[PDB]
Amino acid sequence: EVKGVCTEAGMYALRERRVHVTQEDFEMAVAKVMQKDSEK
Amino acid sequence: MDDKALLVEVQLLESKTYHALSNLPKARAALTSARTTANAIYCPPKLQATLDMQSGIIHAAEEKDWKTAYSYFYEAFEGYDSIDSPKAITSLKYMLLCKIMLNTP
Amino acid sequence: SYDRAITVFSPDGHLFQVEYAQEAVKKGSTAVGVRGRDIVVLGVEKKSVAKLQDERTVRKICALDDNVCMAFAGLTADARIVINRARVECQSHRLTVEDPVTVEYITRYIASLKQRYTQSNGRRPFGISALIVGFDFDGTPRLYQTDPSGTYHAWKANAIGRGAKSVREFLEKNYTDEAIETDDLTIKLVIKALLEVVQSGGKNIELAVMRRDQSLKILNPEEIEKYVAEIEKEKEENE
Amino acid sequence: ERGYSFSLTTFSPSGKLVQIEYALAAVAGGAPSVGIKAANGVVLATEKKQKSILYDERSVHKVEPITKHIGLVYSGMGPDYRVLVHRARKLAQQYYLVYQEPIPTAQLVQRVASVMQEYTQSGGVRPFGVSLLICGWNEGRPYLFQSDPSGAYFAWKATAMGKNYVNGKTFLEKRYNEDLELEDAIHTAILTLKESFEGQMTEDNIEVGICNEAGFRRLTPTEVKDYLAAIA
Amino acid sequence: TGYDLSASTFSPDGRVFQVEYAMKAVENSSTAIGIRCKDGVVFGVEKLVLSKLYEEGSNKRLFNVDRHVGMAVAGLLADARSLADIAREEASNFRSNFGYNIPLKHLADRVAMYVHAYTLYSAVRPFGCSFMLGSYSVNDGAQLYMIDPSGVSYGYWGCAIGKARQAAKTEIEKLQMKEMTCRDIVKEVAKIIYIVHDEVKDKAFELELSWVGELTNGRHEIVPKDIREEAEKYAKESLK
Amino acid sequence: SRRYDSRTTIFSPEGRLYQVEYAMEAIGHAGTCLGILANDGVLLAAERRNIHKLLDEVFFSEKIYKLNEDMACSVAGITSDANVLTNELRLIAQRYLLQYQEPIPCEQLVTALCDIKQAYTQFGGKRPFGVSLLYIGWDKHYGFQLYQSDPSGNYGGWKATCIGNNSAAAVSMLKQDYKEGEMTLKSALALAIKVLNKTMDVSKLSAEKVEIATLTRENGKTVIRVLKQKEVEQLIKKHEEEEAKAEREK
Amino acid sequence: GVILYGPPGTGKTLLAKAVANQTSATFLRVVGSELIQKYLGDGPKLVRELFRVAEEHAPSIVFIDEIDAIGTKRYDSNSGGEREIQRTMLELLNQLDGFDSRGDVKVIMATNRIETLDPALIRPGRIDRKIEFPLPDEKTKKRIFQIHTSRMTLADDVTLDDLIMAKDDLSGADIKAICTEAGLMALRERRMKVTNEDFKKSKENVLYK
Amino acid sequence: SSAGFDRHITIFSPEGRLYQVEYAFKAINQGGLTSVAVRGKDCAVIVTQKKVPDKLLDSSTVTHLFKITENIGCVMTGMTADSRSQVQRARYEAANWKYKYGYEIPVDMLCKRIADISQVYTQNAEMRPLGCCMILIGIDEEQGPQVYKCDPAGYYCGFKATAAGVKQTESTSFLEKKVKKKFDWTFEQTVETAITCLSTVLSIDFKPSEIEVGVVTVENPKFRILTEAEIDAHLVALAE
Ligand SMILES: Nc1ncnc2c1ncn2[C@@H]1O[C@H](COP(=O)(O)OP(=O)(O)OP(=O)(O)O)[C@@H](O)[C@H]1O
Ligand SMILES: [Mg+2]
């Protein structure tokens, strides 16, 4: 899931059209990947 | 305690009161903390559009990317559609002020 | 009331549950017994000590009366309930006919208890064999054994348990008249016999002699160390 | 006639009693039910949906009293429940005809669970398919116990049985503490049954019984609508 | 398979085959018909002569349960007279306890529950017999009941059990039993069991008739010889 | 009816019998109990299994059952079968006391139960008990005693025995550290925390994960004391203090 | 015919290597697990062409290892269920005592679950000698430690007799498992000889887990 | 889904199911028969059909309505031999209530004693669990009328409208639309809404000889069976 987060953290920076990944994209990404940990 | 949904409200409410009392970077932080909290609730049925508005407020409070800030107020209005007429009619203001700010009259 | 025939005939005339029980005997520890003309000597081997247990609770030589000892092999759970039923019968004989129980009489009680129990409904047969050793009235030392089918059977020397064919084949080439000459000389037959079995180099053997007037007398592992020295010492010099 | 007189519950070669394992699967497919003790009394709550509008919901009851001060719910199959209720009704009476004292809640679970163990070993029977939750206030301190079809029992602070019980126990772990009142425990017991119910939770879809020092009682559907109001 | 060995197991579509297998043993017994007239019940049993060595009057398939109740059986004969013993014993305990002769709606109820009790367990088998009960009372009229091996009983104006069951009760409804007295019935009982069982399968057979009503004063007994010779005089007129 | 019977009583063609060996296979998993004695006193160290954060922790113990006024037992295996055996030999000791007006010797209480347990392995067409259990106690004939039962029905006296999930790992270490008749009831307590440090895969020895009860002889008391959870953890760290010194100095 | 049976790890496969050392005949080996196939009829076809190969060479030895595994384990790759295993065994039951002229082919079989397989295959005529292997005795265990520690630089710290009765019923396979793993603990510390505490932590690693 | 003898006797499947009971629910459907019970404001009506295929059979002995006690009647579905044995228990258990306790048994306490007996058959692995159903009606004081169903699993519940048999699911879909419009129910309306239930499900539009109606009312709490003349009174008033 570490690569599950870090690859998905680029999508947050891309969906708001940035060119640098910020430190609030990762903490936005952890709360989605660990949500599926809480799913089944 | 048990709840998770009401944490979204008080973080979003603090996001209202640092910007209204003129403190942008602390309002940036509390808005961000409500982003990473609302990413785990299964049903934000109406609170998403409430969060979609002030995602566009603070991002337009620095005037960096008007086009993406326009996209927040679009989704903030689509959530408000036909269920909340006081909050919907103010949502036309923030999308068309940004569109004039986009210089497409 | 569980009513079901457990022991039935085979299509060639065997009782399968009986001869399956004879293999439970064939992996219990070895028990050897000979008789002298004045003192009997029987002793189990393969004590298999783990040096953290009470040595008296693991015993397999018990007494039914003053005159009757008993050794066994097989599984120990079924053994100590056959013993406790035999202690009751040899005690109720004294309320009847006043003399103590002859050693032949108590084996007919055990074998007839063991037979009809391969005949009843809903009962697997016993999985033990026994050696009953006693010097009766008028001082006649003799011994018997008990097949799990229930055939009491007298002997001059015998051995049951794991590795019983090799020991019985050893005794037939070794049981002379002068081997039972002295009381300390008959014991040298048994300790030579159990050493020709599963190893038991003075640490796993437990003899128990009876001099036709005493009770059973277990020698501690000092004379067995003394006897195994001289039993090897005669073998040290002849070859 | 007569019986069978042989156990049809044997050990697997892996060392597991298979019929008891299968009986727990019938317990897990039952209606969900939660139970919480909080410092002055115990709240039992269950979830009762009729299959259609034709059923009379005020005819049968899940929550049952055993004596003045002991209540009992289940999560399993229906007709097996009514057997060991009537058995437990009688066991409280032979204790009372001897000692002239209401039975302690610990001693009742000693004797109900000893029935179910005796019933999973004897000849020609299959084990029960229910689990139980037993409450009561004996000598001030309240109690909450849970049995199983095997015959064991436990002492819970809060638990959940039935469907989604592994999600109920995680929900209670983030909500329950040591210091709650009885009416606070009611609001968090309806909040955990709302995790798995249907769309509408009315005054007749659930059934709640409570204990106090005043004794066990079962809530009428009037105030159950009051607790269901101002919920979630 | 495996669902049809015991009587304690349903099928995967929900029926017991041990009862249905035992019903199939009834259609190897020959034929027993019985119809009730206006004022009585007349039984009738056609009886196979297996060999010449047996005696005329052997192994009667037509019993006598109480003073007024009659029984005609079709099935496995050892099970038939076993049911005839408990039914004869049940009527004795009614009179010894309640003082009067047992009625038929109660008598066939007590026997059928005893038959039903052997279709529940693996320890016993179901009976292989179907039979009929008929009687007459002055306060009740005539009665006619029938019991299958499953334990189901009903009333009839006329019934038939044996090999050719449908081929026998085809001609029963041609009659008019609502108005006929039990004298013309005896000729008509024998006629409809002559048109059945062609002489290809059986060489020779035997008529056996029974008879109850107020003409018999309520008692059950066999017909006299002269009356059934009239019915056997009425035999060879069905060839036209 | 004979098609549905499972024949839990007959032998196997290889001589042994399958049904209790499956039960002695189930006694391998699900629990850990051990005992030790060399002097005045005897202890039972048991490892708790259900360590969930929502339980009341009542009934004075979990796997320790006081049988007589001067002996107790630790149990392992199927817990529902355990409760029936416990209140079965609990009144064997009382009907002895009713008959002789004297407390029961600890050995012939074990032989009385192990005849009941043996009978289910032998007739009746019945599932045996999947329960093995220890016995501590005192009597005037031999003093402090220690016994072990088996689901087959045979018992034995011991000095140190475990029936845990890694019992064979524990017994191999018990006969590497011992002394016959000199391990007093502080070195035995120190040796008990060392053994279940090893056989428990859950490390660091949480003080709520174990149970320890001692049986010491006071003049007319024979005090059976389940020691509380305030003196366990000081005995835990006492093992932890010396092991850092013994490793670093070697 | 010759069959070899006993507890697992007592040296059944080990003795067949010694026969393959000594003999001059061609030696054929097949595991019993790989007799079962995935297509219908492909199983008995493989047995017919196994004894085809064995006869068409020489005097030869056919070694079939773990033949209980044809019956114990069920695999979902096999389309036919147990009634395709059976048709495979009927073909093998032919090839041992068919009516065809057999020739010079010896058959060696090995298993550890001897009570499971078909007694029609173990009758005299197809298999004559039945050889049991026991667990190693405590004076033969000492022989095995002498063998597997022959060419290793054994330091004189150790005493082999403490290692013998460590487990009461340790097989011959357990001894080699201790002796190899104790050597692996030496190479973690670049040593050349094996000390006593190597064997102390060896049996903790091998046996007790 | 299956392991062991779980298809054959009453033990658990690996899925937690048990098949011998749910094989027995569809032994009810082999009768080819359907009964409907409707509770009113001051009455309770059972209606069921009867299928008489022969003219030789007595039409007065095929009643599925049974009088349990003087104030409690019942209808039986499922197979006939097991249904009539279960009525024999209910007549017996009601008489022991009056002898032990000195007053008339309530109808729910009677249905509890029947379901407890039926529970034992699916509890021991020896008996066959009686594939027939059970519907009771009766008047209870301070409760009005009330209807109860008992199935062979041991389950029971009080209903407001009830169907049982082959066309059970189509009839309950009819009645739940009828009851949720919340019309008030007189005596004649409950009789009309119970005949028109199975007259539209089965689509027969029958004459008064195929059905039979039992009823109880709080002005005459006797369980009474309607005459064919007065069934015809309700039937011609149904066609306006
Ligand atoms: N008696 C023995 N003498 C020497 N080596 C032995 C002995 N027994 C076992 N071994 C060692 O154990 C290893 C495995 O033995 P082997 O596989 O032949 O036993 P097995 O019974 O055939 O095993 P399996 O039952 O799994 O087929 C061999 O490599 C051998 O070195
Ligand atoms: Mg091998």
UniProtKB/Swiss-Prot annotation, chain A:
Belongs to the AAA ATPase family. It is found in: Cytoplasm; Nucleus. The chain holds residues 358 to 397 of 406 of the full protein. This is 26S proteasome regulatory subunit 8. It comes from the Eukaryota. Component of the 26S proteasome, a multiprotein complex involved in the ATP-dependent degradation of ubiquitinated proteins. This complex plays a key role in the maintenance of protein homeostasis by removing misfolded or damaged proteins, which could impair cellular functions, and by removing proteins whose functions are no longer required. Therefore, the proteasome participates in numerous cellular processes, including cell cycle progression, apoptosis, or DNA damage repair. Component of the 19S proteasome regulatory particle complex. The 26S proteasome consists of a 20S core particle (CP) and two 19S regulatory subunits (RP). The regulatory particle is made of a lid composed of 9 subunits, a base containing 6 ATPases including PSMC5 and few additional components. Component of a complex with USP49 and RUVBL1. Interacts with PRPF19. Interacts with TRIM5. Interacts with NDC80. Interacts with PAAF1. Interacts, in vitro, with the thyroid hormone receptor (in a thyroid hormone T3-dependent manner) and with retinoid X receptor (RXR). Interacts with ERCC6.
Curated annotation (Swiss-Prot), chain D:
The modification Phosphotyrosine is found at residues 4, 22, 74, 119. GO terms for biological process: proteasome-mediated ubiquitin-dependent protein catabolic process; response to virus. It holds the Pfam family Proteasome_A_N. The keyword Phosphoprotein applies. The modification N6-acetyllysine is found at residues 68, 169. It is found in: Cytoplasm; Nucleus. InterPro entries: Ntn_hydrolases_N, Proteasome_alpha, Proteasome_alpha-type, Proteasome_asu_N, Proteasome_sua/b. Keywords: Acetylation, Cytoplasm, Nucleus, Phosphoprotein, Proteasome. GO terms for cellular component: cytoplasm; cytosol; extracellular exosome; extracellular region; ficolin-1-rich granule lumen; nucleoplasm; nucleus; P-body. Phosphorylated on tyrosine residues; which may be important for nuclear import. This is Proteasome subunit alpha type-2. The gene is PSMA2.
From Swiss-Prot, chain E:
It is found in: Cytoplasm; Nucleus. One of its GO terms (biological process) is proteasome-mediated ubiquitin-dependent protein catabolic process. GO terms for cellular component: cytoplasm; cytosol; extracellular exosome; nucleoplasm; nucleus; proteasome complex; proteasome core complex; proteasome core complex, alpha-subunit complex. One of its GO terms (molecular function) is ubiquitin protein ligase binding. Gene3D superfamilies: Glutamine Phosphoribosylpyrophosphate, subunit 1, domain 1 (3.60.20.10). CDD domains: proteasome_alpha_type_3. It comes from the Eukaryota. The modification Phosphoserine is found at residue 238. Pfam families: Proteasome (PF00227), Proteasome_A_N (PF10584). Its main location: cytoplasm. The modification N6-acetyllysine is found at residues 52, 201, 225. Induction: Down-regulated by antioxidants BO-653 and probucol. Up-regulated by bacterial lipopolysaccharides (LPS) and TNF. Keywords: Acetylation, Cytoplasm, Host-virus interaction, Nucleus, Phosphoprotein, Proteasome. Belongs to the peptidase T1A family. PANTHER family: PROTEASOME SUBUNIT ALPHA/BETA (PTHR11599). Component of the 20S core proteasome complex involved in the proteolytic degradation of most intracellular proteins. This complex plays numerous essential roles within the cell by associating with different regulatory particles. Associated with two 19S regulatory particles, forms the 26S proteasome and thus participates in the ATP-dependent degradation of ubiquitinated proteins. This is Proteasome subunit alpha type-3. It comes from Homo sapiens (Human).
Curated annotation (Swiss-Prot), chain F:
InterPro entries: Ntn_hydrolases_N, Proteasome_alpha, Proteasome_alpha-type, Proteasome_asu_N, Proteasome_bsu_CS, Proteasome_sua/b. The modification N6-acetyllysine is found at residues 126, 175. It is found in: Cytoplasm; Nucleus. GO terms for biological process: proteasome-mediated ubiquitin-dependent protein catabolic process. Induction: Down-regulated by antioxidants BO-653 and probucol. GO terms for cellular component: cytoplasm; cytosol; extracellular exosome; intracellular membrane-bounded organelle; nucleoplasm; nucleus; P-body; proteasome complex. Its main location: cytoplasm. Keywords: Acetylation, Cytoplasm, Host-virus interaction, Nucleus, Phosphoprotein, Proteasome. Component of the 20S core proteasome complex involved in the proteolytic degradation of most intracellular proteins. This complex plays numerous essential roles within the cell by associating with different regulatory particles. Associated with two 19S regulatory particles, forms the 26S proteasome and thus participates in the ATP-dependent degradation of ubiquitinated proteins. NCBIfam families: PRK03996.1. Belongs to the peptidase T1A family. This is Proteasome subunit alpha type-4. It comes from Homo sapiens. The lineage of its organism: Eukaryota, Metazoa, Chordata, Craniata, Vertebrata.
